[PDB]
């Protein structure tokens, strides 16, 4: 049915990725406990994790592996202009999970991006119909929830920040 070869290849890729995360930021178990601070899995969060490592591998969804993956992932964007998105990934999920509306002006600006334009060009065969009925690409922009940060904080920011930085993130796709 399903061969074990590619699955074990993916697992070993996961293990070496964890090794690199440990090597880069001299992290260990204790800082890991600090970063989790008693949090649990967030669906859109693991989805972002899958997006960021899509080219590298497929996520196995093991718990501690996911948390280490987010540690490395969050710091990784922590280096460059990404400012607020890592803060959101730091937060835990608030219980107001819903789908707020989208600022159509910002999404139009997204369409204006020649970067995203050439992505559409690489998705043009899909773009011609599948998006027209329902664009999966920005559908997650509708799917915006509320977060409850561990530092007694909640997410309250303009959507331009994800509009720009997640655009860069698809540029990393």
């Amino acid at each position: 049915r399903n061969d074990q070869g590619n699955s074990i290849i993916n697992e070993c890729s996961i293990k070496q990725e964890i090794a690199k995360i440990k090597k880069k930021y001299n992290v260990t178990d204790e800082v890991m406990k600090e970063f989790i601070n008693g949090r649990e899995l967030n669906s859109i969060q693991i989805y972002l994790v899958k997006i960021y490592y899509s080219n590298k591998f497929k996520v196995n969804s093991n718990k501690n592996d996911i948390f280490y993956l987010l540690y490395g992932m969050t710091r990784e964007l922590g280096e460059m202009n990404f400012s607020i998105i890592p803060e959101i990934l730091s937060c835990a999920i608030a219980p107001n999970v819903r789908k707020m509306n989208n600022r159509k002006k910002l999404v139009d600006k997204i369409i204006h991006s020649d970067k995203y334009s050439y992505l559409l060009k690489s998705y043009l065969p899909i773009k011609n119909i599948l998006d027209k009925n329902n664009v999966i690409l920005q559908l997650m922009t509708i799917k915006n929830a509320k977060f409850m940060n561990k530092e007694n904080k909640e997410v309250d920011f303009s959507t331009d920040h994800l509009a720009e930085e997640v655009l860069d993130m698809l540029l990393c796709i």
Binding site: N6, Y47, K50, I51, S54, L119, K121, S122, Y123, L124, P125, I126, K127, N128, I129, L130, I136, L137, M140, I173
Partner: protein, 121 residues
């Protein structure tokens, strides 16, 4: 030289199915010339005729991306030679094909075949 003489032909017939789920890839040519399978004059390259990606609604954000490059978990077909003839059977209305960019080659071939049948009739 003698071995070069003992040349022998070989012909293969192979059929591929495309459902609503699986989609083809632009293996051959640039963006403008979307051809997942070599044309009549073309020779099959890299011992691969075409390939299909198993589309999923959920996996539309990572896997379906980079359509030009094949993904690891796909279904290719393998052969060698030069295309001699093509025969397509379609059960879907042509409107979808019209709004399908990744089905322009099959639509073109279907139009050619239909024109042939019209002329013969």
């Amino acid at each position: 030289s003698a071995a070069k003489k003992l040349g022998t032909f070989s012909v293969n017939k192979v059929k591929v199915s495309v459902n609503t789920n699986d989609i083809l890839l632009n293996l051959y040519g640039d963006n403008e010339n979307y051809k997942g399978f070599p044309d009549i004059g073309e020779h099959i390259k890299n011992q691969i005729i075409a390939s299909r990606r198993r589309f999923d609604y959920n996996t539309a954000l990572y896997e379906l991306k980079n359509l030009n490059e094949m993904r690891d978990s796909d279904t290719p077909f393998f052969a060698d030679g030069k295309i001699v003839d093509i025969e397509i059977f379609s059960n879907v209305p042509e409107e979808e094909l019209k709004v399908q960019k990744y089905n322009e080659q099959v639509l073109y071939y279907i139009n050619k075949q239909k024109e042939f049948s019209n002329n013969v009739y």
